[PDB]
Design a protein around this nucleic acid. Structure first.
Ligand SMILES: [Mg+2]
Ligand SMILES: [Mg+2]
Ligand SMILES: [Mg+2]
Ligand SMILES: [Mg+2]
Ligand SMILES: [Mg+2]
Ligand SMILES: [Mg+2]
Ligand SMILES: [Mg+2]
Ligand SMILES: [Mg+2]
Ligand SMILES: [Mg+2]
Ligand SMILES: [Mg+2]
Ligand SMILES: [Mg+2]
Ligand SMILES: [Mg+2]
Ligand SMILES: [Mg+2]
Ligand SMILES: [Mg+2]
Ligand SMILES: [Mg+2]
Ligand SMILES: [Mg+2]
Ligand SMILES: [Mg+2]
Ligand SMILES: [Mg+2]
Ligand SMILES: [Mg+2]
Ligand SMILES: [Mg+2]
Ligand SMILES: [Mg+2]
Ligand SMILES: [Mg+2]
Ligand SMILES: [Mg+2]
Ligand SMILES: [Mg+2]
Ligand SMILES: [Mg+2]
Ligand SMILES: [Mg+2]
Ligand SMILES: [Mg+2]
Ligand SMILES: [Mg+2]
Ligand SMILES: [Mg+2]
Ligand SMILES: [Mg+2]
Ligand SMILES: [Mg+2]
Ligand SMILES: [Mg+2]
Ligand SMILES: [Mg+2]
Ligand SMILES: [Mg+2]
Ligand SMILES: [Mg+2]
Ligand SMILES: [Mg+2]
Ligand SMILES: [Mg+2]
Ligand SMILES: [Mg+2]
Ligand SMILES: [Mg+2]
Ligand SMILES: [Mg+2]
Ligand SMILES: [Mg+2]
Lengths: 52, 187, 124, 52, 147, 105
RNA sequence: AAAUACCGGCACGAGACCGAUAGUCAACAAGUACCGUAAGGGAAAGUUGAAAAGAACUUUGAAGAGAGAGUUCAAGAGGGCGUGAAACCGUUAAGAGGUAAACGGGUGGGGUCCGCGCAGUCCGCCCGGAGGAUUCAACCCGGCGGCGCGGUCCGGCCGUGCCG
RNA sequence: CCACGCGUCCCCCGCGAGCGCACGGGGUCGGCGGCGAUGUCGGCUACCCACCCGACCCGUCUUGAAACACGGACCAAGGAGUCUAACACGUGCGCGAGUCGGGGGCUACGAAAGCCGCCGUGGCGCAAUGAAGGUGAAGGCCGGCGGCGCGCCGCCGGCCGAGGUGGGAUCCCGAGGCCUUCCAGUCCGCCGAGGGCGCACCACCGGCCCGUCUCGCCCGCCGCGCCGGGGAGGUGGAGCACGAG
RNA sequence: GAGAAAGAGAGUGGCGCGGACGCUACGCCGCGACGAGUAGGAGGGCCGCUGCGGUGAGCCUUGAAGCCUAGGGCGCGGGCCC
RNA sequence: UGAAAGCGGGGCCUCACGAUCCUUCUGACCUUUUGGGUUUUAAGCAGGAGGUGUCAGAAAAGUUACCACAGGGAUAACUGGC
């Protein structure tokens, strides 16, 4: 964390460097999807397979 | 047979990004689900905008975000960008913004956060609002790229202000026969 | 996390094996031994595995515990079951069901325990 | 993620010591195998001698 | 990589992507930019207008060092000085006005493009514009020349 | 034979350029040779400054660069005489001299 | 003087290079053999085996060449000898044969081998019938694990949080 | 006859059960029979041969090749869109009004890798335009001081302060109701008449900067001049009009 | 899956310890219509060759590369495994 | 010009004509002439002209039976074909 820096302090042993920011943070997708925020706001699954 | 023409038989549009980035593909795996399984079309637009290319999602600046969130009515809403919220140094006072972009540059992060704002990503955006309501979706300036100064009706053709491909802007470099009227003809 | 690790291990892992238009995963705790997110034995917070014991009778069932994720030595717990074929499967069934311990693959564990017990009763 | 566990230092006889340093933020910088492959591809060409 | 290019997919195909009727001959329209007046006339009229001919005076021994005068705008004038000078100048009630030396930053000429915020300034430039100066005056502020 | 739209250009390859091409594969061997020579000289002039002599504040000439101060060639004779240093003793005690420099300020 | 250039020379080190029709013209008695009056042109050509242990001796022929015997792990490695394809050829076996042969689709017949075929699948639950184990549930002791459903048990640690 | 009963006010004349059959969201048998150890059973394909139908030899240039068009006896190996530079567009990646150490320096593989930041010199970008001198990219309102047959306004202090029109993905408000016995009646979502704020983008009108032309009256002073600045209306620009490199 | 904008919504008063497959989400599945092709353009190759960084606790004198094959096969095919 | 409405920026309409470089003339109290100033001079800027009749614009005489090379049956001298 002196060389490569932390997320809030910069690199003490580089000149102008800080760690690269994430593009999504909560990476666990299934805990996002099995959550009461999203599971309320979804239509019902149509999984009745309708063959010809 | 059948007399179809099969020329335009295939829709050209993207089904997936051409990036092997994995955080982008996990955002895709979240918004495939939200677009397939909600009825709100914000998720379909955000799915189609995560699909795009770097030159199709251009960076809007913080000045555009400030103005287009200062338009009356959309107070304390959530700006949603799929490109990059870059800083704009020719603005001084920044209001409290609630932004959501893929990547926000460093001094723009410092600017928004010490203005008192809040910078989300798309995962906690979708936890905050799955159908995406209370959100102002925004786009970057897409004809802003300098390659569009060369596109359109050709130079050397009247009523067409198309920048031509010249290896150096100067006095000797394409100023003479098509441009003057004393030399040749003007268009 | 888990999906982040899967987006790396899904194609460039060493347990992966690709030939004859099939695909498998030779990793040490894979029920059904196939390359999938569902059955992978390295990328989850909780995982069962069914192995034949060092003694040539019965099944060691491997559980991945909850606390020591980044500690690979005290992460897995072995239980040896050297019983009849009915109560071995009943023990694996209760162990995965009634703990609510990753019930995606209770039936895959029961199949794999039965295949080991088939191979462990003597040959024709 | 955002949190930092407390990694213990192991003594040279193997058993865990009493020293316990927090995990630096480099270890929660993002994992991107495409950037790793790209930089590795383009930098393993720099130790390379000509032929003709 | 030649693993990914087009000459791999074009093995077996007899003409290799260049036709049977008109072949891939060596130089069918001359080398390079040839035939500018004669037989590529339509390309050099439709796409490079103004190309042939002379215009303007000949300057023999030219020096970019003599003709050097870069520009800043009023829109980015306050970039040059740190943020605490702005907030101290706005915080200040004694009327003291900060001095922006643009030549220290390296821009010789102040131009006036954008809005300038309502703080008294002293802009110490080499050259000015009429609109840059009158926007500085209208905000309140002075335009100091330095050679 | 140019295509639809694109910058018409003058590549200077009409000569025989392949016979005269200077390739830089001894770039790091040159760097190691120079720093070996620099270490050898810096230890053979043993307490003396490794950078060489001292060289004056002097100001870059033209309109583009006269706000910048550089390190110049050597101290002028007027400067050495006002500082009392003899023009032949300066090169011995470590001061660089050039006789060509004026002083107009 | 220094920084700088070096496809000749002396001595080196290395390679995402070539692997005997490639890489130098040259892996070898190569600027050699050879051609030209001359200036100059200029090849082809690597490999027995681990070790020559390179086939003593008998026998037909004048001999090259064989047949035996022998060395070797192997002569199915025998002095231009590792591996030994294709074009082409000898012979053996099988099959055929007056529209030059050959070919695509469809079967038929004959071979060659393969199926370790030739009384032909097993897997669960159940009933009935003959057996055999130190034997199932429930309880006890110990360990290990999983989880506000301890609303709100005690303590640490962390914050890409805040305030003192 | 795809008509079912009761009880009441009016006129003109919402849960009954059980089985079962099937012209009903694509085949089943809860039906059978033979032959099988030294001669038979299965193997389309791959070996040979036979018969019927089809069947001209490839490449190529060609308007057209089986051509009385040229190349080809047969085989094995070799054998033809490469690399450097420049430019353009698309796409991926990092940073982002910045960006890049490529040149130099500091510290077996490693001639790599790391580091420089008062080594960003410099490139490209952030500003255009003119041949050049050069110039160099919103305005309005208030109060005060025909001016005359600058109601415009010249100059001073304050205020608002960075276009509009049309179409626009997205969002925002919500006339109403989405039943489980009926009435009032809250909270959570959901659908929607109508109405909004409107990203990118496109079409248009305005506005700003540089050249150029035309018409005009003002203003500044250290040098009152062949000085400097201003405005209104078109028009030339590879411009601006809240970065995109 | 059902011809009909939207809740198998919450609230206030009048014994036996049992339940198949799945989901390499670049995966798997369901509906429809479609399939000519020289010059040319594009996509996919678990088609192939030579070498390098990884990796298979890979293979190999109990016989690797190569070559031959009336043998068993797979794939539309390039080819590949025995 | 006509009293006037109006008409007229060549010929009642349909043809009568010419890019870059170069030269020449015209124009403004114009710009540059290079460290400063004056003066000639040159360079510019804008508009005519000098001309490319192969008319979107090279500066150009023959012969070969001593002949050659790259091609063409796009194309002649034979037969054959309609
Ligand atoms: Mg059809
Ligand atoms: Mg077609
Ligand atoms: Mg198409
Ligand atoms: Mg083709
Ligand atoms: Mg082509
Ligand atoms: Mg051809
Ligand atoms: Mg062509
Ligand atoms: Mg042609
Ligand atoms: Mg070419
Ligand atoms: Mg011509
Ligand atoms: Mg072309
Ligand atoms: Mg080395
Ligand atoms: Mg050879
Ligand atoms: Mg060889
Ligand atoms: Mg050779
Ligand atoms: Mg040879
Ligand atoms: Mg040999
Ligand atoms: Mg052998
Ligand atoms: Mg041998
Ligand atoms: Mg041999
Ligand atoms: Mg034979
Ligand atoms: Mg025969
Ligand atoms: Mg026939
Ligand atoms: Mg031909
Ligand atoms: Mg031809
Ligand atoms: Mg012809
Ligand atoms: Mg043709
Ligand atoms: Mg003929
Ligand atoms: Mg002929
Ligand atoms: Mg020919
Ligand atoms: Mg021939
Ligand atoms: Mg070959
Ligand atoms: Mg192009
Ligand atoms: Mg691009
Ligand atoms: Mg087709
Ligand atoms: Mg007129
Ligand atoms: Mg002069
Ligand atoms: Mg003079
Ligand atoms: Mg004669
Ligand atoms: Mg000839
Ligand atoms: Mg005739």
């Amino acid at each position: 964390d002196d060389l490569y820096g932390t997320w809030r302090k910069a690199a003490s042993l580089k000149s102008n460097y800080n760690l690269p920011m994430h593009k999504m943070l909560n990476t666990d997708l299934s805990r996002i999807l099995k959550s009461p925020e999203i599971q309320r706001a979804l239509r019902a699954p149509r999984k009745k397979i309708h063959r010809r | 047979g059948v007399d179809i023409r099969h020329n335009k038989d295939r829709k050209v549009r993207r089904k997936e990004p051409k990036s092997q980035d994995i955080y982008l593909r996990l955002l895709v795996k979240l918004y495939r689900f939200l677009a397939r399984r909600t009825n709100s079309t914000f998720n379909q637009v955000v799915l189609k905008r995560l699909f795009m290319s770097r030159t199709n999602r251009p960076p809007l600046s913080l000045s555009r975000m400030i103005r287009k969130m200062k338009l009356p009515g959309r107070e304390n809403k959530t700006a949603v960008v799929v490109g990059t919220v870059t800083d704009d140094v020719r603005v001084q006072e920044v209001p409290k913004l609630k932004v959501c972009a893929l990547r926000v540059t460093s001094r723009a992060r410092s600017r928004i956060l010490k203005a008192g704002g809040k910078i989300l990503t798309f995962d906690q955006l979708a936890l905050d609002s799955p159908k995406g309501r209370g959100t102002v979706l925004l786009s970057g300036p897409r004809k802003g790229r300098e390659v569009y100064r060369h596109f359109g009706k050709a130079p050397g053709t009247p009523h067409s202000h198309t920048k031509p491909y010249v290896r150096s802007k100067g006095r000797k470099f394409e100023r003479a026969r098509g441009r003057r009227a004393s030399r040749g003809y003007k268009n | 996390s888990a999906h982040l690790q899967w987006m790396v291990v899904r194609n460039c892992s060493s347990f992966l094996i690709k030939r004859n238009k099939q695909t498998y995963s030779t990793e040490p705790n894979n029920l059904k031994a196939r390359n999938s997110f569902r059955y992978n034995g390295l990328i989850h917070r909780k995982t069962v595995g069914v192995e034949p014991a060092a003694d040539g009778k019965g099944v060691v069932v491997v559980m991945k515990r909850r606390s020591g994720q980044r500690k690979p030595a005290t992460s897995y717990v072995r239980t040896t079951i050297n019983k009849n074929a009915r109560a071995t499967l009943s023990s694996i069934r209760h162990m995965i069901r009634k703990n609510k311990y990753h019930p995606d693959l209770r039936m895959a564990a029961i199949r794999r325990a039965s295949a080991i017990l088939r191979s462990q009763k003597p040959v024709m | 993620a955002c949190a930092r566990p407390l990694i213990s230092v192991y003594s040279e006889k193997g058993e865990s010591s009493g020293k316990n340093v927090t995990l630096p933020a480099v270890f929660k910088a993002p994992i991107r195998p495409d950037i790793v492959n790209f930089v590795h591809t383009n930098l393993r060409k720099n130790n390379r001698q000509p032929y003709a | 990589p030649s693993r990914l290019r087009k000459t791999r997919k074009l093995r077996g195909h007899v003409s290799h992507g260049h036709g049977r009727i008109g072949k891939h001959r060596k130089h069918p329209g001359g080398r390079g930019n040839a035939g500018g007046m004669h037989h590529h006339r339509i390309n050099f009229d439709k796409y490079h207008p103004g190309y042939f001919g002379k215009v303007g005076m000949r300057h023999y021994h030219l020096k970019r060092n003599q003709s050097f005068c870069p520009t800043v705008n009023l829109d980015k004038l306050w970039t040059l000085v740190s943020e605490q000078t702005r907030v101290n100048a706005a915080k200040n009630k004694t009327g003291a006005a900060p001095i922006i030396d643009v030549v220290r930053s390296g821009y010789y000429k102040v131009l006036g493009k954008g809005k300038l915020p309502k703080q008294p300034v002293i802009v110490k430039a080499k050259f000015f514009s009429r609109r840059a100066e009158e926007k500085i005056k209208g905000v309140g502020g002075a335009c100091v020349l330095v050679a | 034979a140019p295509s639809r739209n694109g910058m018409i250009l003058k590549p200077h390859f009409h000569k025989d350029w392949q016979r005269r091409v200077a390739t830089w594969f001894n770039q790091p061997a040159r760097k190691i040779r120079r720093r070996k020579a620099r270490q050898a000289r810096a230890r053979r002039i043993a307490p003396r400054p490794a950078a060489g002599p001292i060289r004056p504040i002097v100001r870059c000439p033209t309109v583009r660069y006269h706000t910048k101060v550089r390190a110049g060639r050597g101290f002028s004779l007027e400067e050495l005489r006002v500082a009392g240093i003899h023009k032949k003793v300066a090169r011995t005690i470590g001061i660089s001299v050039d006789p060509r420099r004026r002083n107009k300020s």
